[PDB]
A and B are shown apart, each in its own frame.
With several copies, the nearest count.
Chain A
Amino acid sequence: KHKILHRLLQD
């Protein structure tokens, strides 16, 4: 869950 948010935060 929360795919987009996680990606944006790791980057």
Chain B
Amino acid sequence: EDMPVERILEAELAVEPNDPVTNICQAADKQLFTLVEWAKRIPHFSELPLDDQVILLRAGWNELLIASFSHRSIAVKDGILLATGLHVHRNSAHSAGVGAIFDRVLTELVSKMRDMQMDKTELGCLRAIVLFNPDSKGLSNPAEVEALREKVYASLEAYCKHKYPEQPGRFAKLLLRLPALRSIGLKCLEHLFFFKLIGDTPIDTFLMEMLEAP
């Protein structure tokens, strides 16, 4: 009841016009600020209590950020395009020791988004569905968050079926990337925790704050 795909697309278009791992971390810290402004632009997000806004962003920042640069890298050959305006080629990631996860991002995400020509509007929604995760621990009123999530995927199914009539199974195909994203998101965090432990790899204040407890 008041979750138009138009406002969602606007949040998306408004936020985005030497050790590959270090460059990746610098970019993630950078994107963390933008993600806050993005969320604020998502209908009804700001009306939730500040504590739930914090929970939702702390719970999904990683998947949210992985979906973005994946879709951003759709035109790239074998690598992702970082927000810092830097490209990380498959081989670069391989010789830095993170080839496995990088390959999972190329195969399970970038490639699939490309094969189905996922559009910016569809992305925005998938990210909005991820933001509104009713399963986040701590939520003061999870049912409310579940309501928002339902309005989002209702508008998405509406956008689909109407924009891609020839494709009756497009709605599901889009939601079915969510298990992959969650999986790749958990693996990426593990790496982030290891890098922190190791002591190498500079980690900026906002990215560091995300690795705090809980």
A/B touching: CB–CB < 8 A: yes
The residue that B36 contacts in the complex, of A1, A3, A8, with Cβ under 8 A, is A8
Set of chain B residues within 8 Å of A2, measured between Cβ atoms: 54, 58, 209, 212
If A1-B212, A2-B58 touch, does A9 touch B50 (CB 8 Å cutoff)?
yes
A9 to B, closest residue via Cβ: B53
Chain B contact residues: helix, strand, loop or mixed: helix
A3 to B, closest residue via Cβ: B209
CB distance from A10 to the nearest CB of B (A): 7
A5 to B, closest residue via Cβ: B54
Set of chain A residues within 8 Å of B213, measured between Cβ atoms: 1
> A9–B209 Cα gap in the complex (Å)?
15
How many residues of B are in contact with the other chain, CB < 8 A?
Answer: 13
Set of chain B residues within 8 Å of A8, measured between Cβ atoms: 33, 36
Chain A's interface size range is under 10
Contact with A along B26-50 (1 / 0, CB 8 A): 0000000100100010000000001
A10 engages B36 (CB within 8 Å): no
Contact with A along B44-77 (1 / 0, CB 8 A): 0000001001100110000000000000000000
Interface membership of B95, Cβ < 8 A: no
Set of chain B residues within 8 Å of A1, measured between Cβ atoms: 212-213
B35 to A, closest residue via Cβ: A8
> A6–B213 Cα gap in the complex (Å)?
15
A1 to B, closest residue via Cβ: B212
Set of chain A residues within 8 Å of B57, measured between Cβ atoms: 5
> A10–B54 Cα gap in the complex (Å)?
11
What would 26 A/B residue contacts be, using CB atoms closer than 8 Å? A1-B212, A1-B213, A2-B54, A2-B58, A2-B209, A2-B212, A3-B209, A4-B205, A4-B206, A4-B209, A5-B36, A5-B54, A5-B57, A5-B58, A5-B206, A5-B209, A6-B50, A6-B54, A8-B33, A8-B36, A9-B36, A9-B40, A9-B50, A9-B53, A9-B54, A10-B50
Please provide the 4 A-B residue pairs with the shortest distance between their CB atoms, ordered closest to farther.
Answer: A8-B36, A4-B209, A4-B206, A9-B53
Q: A1-B213, A2-B58, A2-B209 are in contact. List 9 more A-B contacts (CB 8 A).
A: A1-B212, A2-B54, A4-B206, A5-B57, A6-B54, A9-B36, A9-B40, A9-B53, A9-B54
